[PDB]
Design a protein around this ligand. Structure first.
Ligand SMILES: [Ca+2]
Ligand SMILES: [Ca+2]
Length: 978
């Protein structure tokens, strides 16, 4: 498809002769026979192009480097079309052209670092093009190597523009019929100051033909024209795209470089200068910062310094200083994205809202939100709605919280923005093999199924909040919550979901971040609800908490319980509401002793002792209050245990059951019926699973099952003893279950949790102790060689006896031989002793008995001190862990207890049979608006506090005084002029 390249582009030949040696440098011997001052084009003959094609550098390389030779006087439009379409290079999001001779093949280390870090990182983030001299020397070589390094670290493309005539091995690049393959010898031994080797890091090269055999500056005009054309081009899609930004980076130079800068500025293309680069660059920087003649002579070599044409050039540059921008090193800042944006914004001026999109996209690609707000969203420009859609999508995909907040702030309609496709893309933005990615793959967004799987399945803002939580983007999730619908319910649901995912996550550090985010959400919800309660107790308490939202169709309290958000239960409003429920219709301030006394004197309730026809109302109010039900159940449970113990210890006989035993059976059946009612009324499978999820219910089921098995066994003629044994164990289970009632008390509440946690430590210590006991017991048993050797006896002497030794029961008479009477026990050789213990073996060997005593000493030490105190240290650590939060645990237990007893029959178990037989909108809008108003007040107060923080004051005063210093310089210059 290259049959037309010669047709459009052309090559230039010296043709005419202008004087041994001529201007063009071609030897007089080799010159056209057709032949004052050399003419760039008049003394030149145009010919079809002949050096087009692709390069494949020998050795390491990409085997593809589009190289084209074209005439200097070529329209940039055709070149741009060729590059964009034929060669497949996508339209750049940015173009940077580097300038400056950079004298010396090796450049300053600071300059090299600044270039390779700042410029190349900016290009990588934005995916830009870089245009430099396609020469493997100095700044061009440095740019090429840095670009290649960042490509390997990965898109950035490097473009070469070098004169045709300073490139070595030109003849290797001449083919009229096509040069798709090509070998370029870029490491030739000979070296000359005229010809230079092409770099091998550039994806494409441009060789301007000026009809000369070697010179410099033959590409300045073409390069400037191409840059200007780029500056006036859209990023594809014809005019539907947006302007492609461009700027020129200057690093040192000479008078010719200064002229190049002046031409570029007259072309209205931004230029950036680096301080300390050297001549032609530092001089302009100093001029911008600000004797002028002295500096011109100082910062530039003596030649041309006297020439006032340099002064005129400097004045011309100053005339259009709006485009030039200096690079503040700032002690190796190596950060200038903000500088690029500042130059781009100050170089536009006119505000049409259609040419500022590219700067916005660049700002999104970077994290210069402050710059964009200061200029792009300063209000001068009229930002539309559709304008910001793409920028918002990009910011969301790249996790730009501040930027997305800014974009939404300035008149962006989320409702008209979010689309099923958009949400699908947002979810597809999951990071590589992330947990959310795994869940989505295992499970259109298809998000309902994953949520139902996690939680249990038993307005764009909500969707965005869910997405942020799933992808674990803290700032964006916080922002989305800040402008949601159901603030408190959303906060609790987010805490629940985050904790579930964290406990499910394998990262072990991502889980830490999720837990931290959950804590932040819980804190925000707690603060918001505290303010809501302070404003109006009745509204908040009654309606906000005890309401089923859309999040999971479960009251806020249920969400808090599932999330274990104890801090939520720990606040004033929740506890006041819980106490009010716990005391039912009675006054919450009634003394406990008053209630207890009234419990045993039912007539007494009709006096002033208890504070709340009237008689029946009062009676039902007293006996229906959940606290009274709790006291009655406690009394009945204690009586049940007493009856159980009585039967078990006295009235249990092989004979058929007696009256008391039948009463116990009826009582146990009643308890079973009550537990069945709890399970069946607290979606049948879902309710059953919820009921079984509570540890106390599991204990109740175990106890009742053991009781049933015991009754069945005893009733059988030949299983009386087994029945009695299992009943004893069942009684133990019931007595342990009795602990549930201690949760009502603050002091005894957390102790249950402490014991439950210490059980795990006991388990692990059991592992350790089992190992040590096996070791020591087997060793001792082998040493003693007792003659009983019966397997149960061996297990006794191996495990049981040392275990008691841990607790001070040391049977010396059964181990020491000095304490036993010697006897001729067995025919086996050696001496034997006869221990007095019943289960110590008939007679033990006394061969090496001192070793047995030594083992006893070591075991006593290790077990009785080291291991026991290791376990005790674990206990102390556990206790301390759940001691600083004792109140929180107690509050959570308070809620669980109140919920349990709020929905229980008013009668105690033994009589509860009759109760069981008896068993057999705009308001929400207003409430949510009130909640949202208080949320806004809370956020505003928090932001006000943040603004008054010391760091914020320091930042604000620093920026303000920077503005003051700028204004002071401005007024000083004004006074100087006048
Ligand atoms: Ca622009
Ligand atoms: Ca229960």
């Amino acid at each position: 498809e290259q049959s037309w390249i010669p047709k459009i582009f052309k090559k230039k030949t010296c043709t005419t002769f202008i004087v041994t040696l001529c201007q063009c440098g071609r030897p007089r011997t080799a010159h056209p026979a057709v032949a004052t001052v050399w003419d760039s084009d008049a003394h030149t003959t145009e010919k079809p192009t002949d050096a087009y094609g692709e390069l494949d550098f020998t050795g390491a390389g990409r085997k593809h480097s589009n190289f084209l030779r074209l005439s200097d006087r070529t329209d940039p439009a055709a070149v741009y079309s060729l590059v964009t379409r034929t060669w497949g290079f996508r339209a750049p999001n940015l173009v940077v052209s580097v300038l400056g001779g950079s004298g010396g093949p090796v450049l300053q280390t600071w300059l090299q670092d600044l270039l390779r870090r700042g410029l190349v990182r900016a290009a990588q983030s934005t995916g830009a093009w870089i245009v430099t001299g396609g020469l493997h020397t100095g700044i061009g070589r440095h740019v090429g190597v840095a670009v290649r390094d960042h490509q390997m670290a990965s898109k950035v493309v490097a473009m070469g523009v070098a004169p045709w005539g300073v490139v070595r091995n030109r003849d290797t690049l001449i083919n009229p019929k096509g040069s798709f393959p090509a070998r370029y010898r870029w490491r030739g031994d000979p070296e000359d100051g005229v010809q230079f080797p092409l770099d091998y890091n550039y994806s494409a090269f441009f060789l301007v033909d000026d009809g000369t055999h070697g010179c410099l500056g033959g590409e300045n005009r073409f390069r400037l024209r191409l840059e200007s054309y780029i500056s006036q081009q859209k990023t594809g899609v014809g005019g539907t795209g947006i302007d492609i930004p461009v700027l020129l980076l200057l690093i040192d130079g000479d008078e010719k470089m200064l002229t190049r800068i002046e031409n570029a500025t007259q072309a209205q293309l931004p230029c950036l200068l680096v301080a300390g680069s050297g001549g032609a660059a530092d001089c302009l920087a100093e001029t911008l910062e600000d004797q002028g003649e002295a500096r011109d002579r100082i910062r530039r070599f003596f030649p041309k310094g006297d020439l006032e044409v340099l002064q005129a050039q400097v004045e011309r540059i100053m005339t259009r200083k709006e485009l030039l921008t200096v690079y503040s090193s700032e002690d190796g800042s190596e950060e200038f994205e903000t500088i690029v944006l500042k130059a781009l914004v100050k170089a536009c001026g006119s505000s049409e809202a259609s040419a500022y999109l590219d700067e916005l996209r660049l700002a999104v690609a970077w994290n210069r939100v402050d710059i964009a707000q200061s200029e792009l969203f300063r209000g001068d420009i009229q930002w539309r709605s559709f304008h910001l859609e793409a920028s918002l999508m990009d910011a969301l995909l790249n996790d730009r919280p501040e930027f997305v907040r800014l974009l939404i702030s300035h008149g962006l309609s989320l409702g008209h923005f979010l689309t099923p496709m958009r949400l699908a893309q947002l979810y597809s933005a999951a990071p590589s093999n992330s947990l959310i990615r795994n869940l989505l793959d295992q499970a259109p967004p298809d998000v309902g199924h994953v949520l139902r799987m996690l939680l249990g399945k038993m307005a764009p803002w909500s969707d965005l909040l869910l997405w942020a939580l799933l992808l674990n983007r803290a700032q964006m999730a916080m922002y989305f919550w800040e402008m949601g619908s159901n603030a408190v319910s959303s906060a609790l649901g987010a805490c629940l979901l985050l904790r579930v995912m964290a406990r499910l996550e394998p990262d072990a550090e991502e889980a830490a971040r999720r837990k931290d985010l959950a804590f932040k959400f819980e804190g925000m919800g707690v603060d918001l609800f505290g303010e809501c309660y302070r404003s109006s107790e009745v509204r908040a308490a009654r309606l906000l908490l005890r309401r089923c939202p859309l999040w999971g169709d479960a009251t806020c309290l249920q969400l808090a319980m599932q999330a274990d958000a104890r801090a939520f239960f720990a606040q004033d409003g929740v506890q006041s509401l819980l106490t009010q429920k716990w005391w039912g219709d009675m006054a919450s301030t009634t003394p406990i002793w008053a209630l207890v006394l009234a419990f045993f004197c039912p007539p007494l309730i009709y006096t002033r002792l208890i504070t709340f026809r009237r008689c029946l109302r009062r009676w039902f109010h007293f006996w229906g209050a959940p606290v009274t039900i709790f006291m009655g159940n406690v009394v009945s449970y204690l009586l049940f245990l007493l009856l159980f113990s009585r039967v078990l210890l006295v009235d249990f006989q092989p004979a058929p059951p007696g009256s008391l035993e039948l009463l116990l059976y009826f009582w146990a059946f009643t308890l079973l019926c009550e537990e069945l009612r709890q399970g069946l009324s607290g979606s049948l499978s879902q309710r059953l699973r919820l009921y079984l999820a509570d540890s106390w219910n599991q204990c109740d089921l175990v106890a009742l099952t053991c009781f049933l098995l015991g009754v069945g066994c005893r009733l059988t003629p030949g299983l009386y003893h087994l029945g009695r044994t299992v009943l004893c164990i069942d009684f133990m289970v019931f007595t342990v279950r009795l602990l549930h009632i201690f949760t009502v008390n603050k002091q005894l509440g957390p102790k249950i949790v402490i014991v439950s946690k210490m059980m795990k430590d006991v388990f692990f210590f059991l592992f350790f102790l089992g190992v040590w006991l096996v070791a020591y017991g087997v060793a001792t048993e082998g040493l003693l060689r007792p003659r009983d050797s019966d397997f149960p006896s061996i297990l006794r002497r191996v495990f049981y006896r040392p275990y008691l030794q841990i607790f001070g029961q040391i049977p010396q008479e059964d181990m020491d031989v000095a304490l036993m009477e010697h006897s001729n026990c067995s025919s086996e050789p050696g001496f034997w002793a006869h221990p007095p213990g019943a289960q110590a073996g008939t007679c033990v060997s006394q061969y090496a008995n001192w070793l047995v005593v030594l083992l006893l000493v070591i075991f006593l030490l290790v077990a009785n001190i080291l291991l026991v105190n290791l376990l005790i240290a674990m206990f102390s650590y556990t206790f301390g862990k759940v001691q600083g939060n004792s109140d929180l645990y107690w509050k959570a237990q308070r809620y669980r207890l109140i919920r349990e007893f709020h929905s229980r029959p008013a009668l105690a178990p033994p009589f509860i049979v009759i109760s069981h037989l008896r068993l057999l909108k705009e308001a929400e809008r207003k409430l949510l608006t009130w909640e949202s108003v208080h949320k806004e007040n809370f956020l505003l107060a928090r932001a006000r506090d943040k603004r008054e923080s010391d760091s914020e004051r320091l930042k604000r005063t620093s920026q303000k005084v920077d503005l003051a210093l700028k204004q002071l310089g401005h007024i000083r210059e004004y006074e100087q002029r006048l």
